[PDB]
Amino acid sequence: MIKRPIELSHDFLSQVLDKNSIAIDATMGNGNDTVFLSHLAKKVYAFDVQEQLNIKNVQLILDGHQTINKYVTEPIRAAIFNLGYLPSTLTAIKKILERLEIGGRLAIMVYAVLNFVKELDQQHFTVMLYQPLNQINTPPFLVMIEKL
């Protein structure tokens, strides 16, 4: 019953989203988070470098999430970011934090950024770590940021 990090990431963003909010999905990929966010927000901007439900309130952008300041102009209520690469960003996060409205939230799922969020001024941002401690395979963890 304890929430997995991925579940809390959704809850965290959902708690502040409404049909007046703009949301960002900085790491589109499969589109699962885009869909989740589209149902809760006025509009969603989604980004990926890689090129049905009649949604229509979503804009897909193909060009570095770090190019946010060139695509979205309005204040942002909620944003989700994925971090970490499978065996085979910092300016983006910074720009999102700047654009977040008061009470706005950024969720970073992690599968230099840590060093950066740790450095944020506690009077202007609350940054919390939510991390499984006893999982045998190294699981994803969540960094929750709320703009004060």
Q: Choose among a copy of itself, ligand SAH, none what residue 146 binds, the Cβ cut-off being 5 to 8 Å by kind.
A: a copy of itself
**DSSP-assigned states of every residue in 28-83:** -TTSHHHHHHHTTSSEEEEE-S-------SEEEE-S-GGGGGGT--S-EEEEEEEE
* Candidate list 1, 53, 86, 112; residue touching a copy of itself; CB under 8 A: 1
- Residues 140 and 133: their CA atoms lie apart, in Å, by 11
Task: State the minimum distance, in angstroms, from the CB of residue 111 to a copy of itself.
Answer: 17
* Chain residues 68-107 in contact with a copy of itself, contact rule CB under 8 A: 103
Mask 64-103, x = binds ligand SAH (CB under 6 A)? xxx---------------x-xxx-----------------
Nearest to a copy of itself of 60, 113 (CB atom): 113
Span of 68-76, 78-86, 92-100, 130-138 interacting with a copy of itself by CB under 8 A: 130-138
Query: Residue 79: which of 36, 140, 116 has the closest Cα?
Result: 36
Contact 82, 92 (CB under 8 A): no
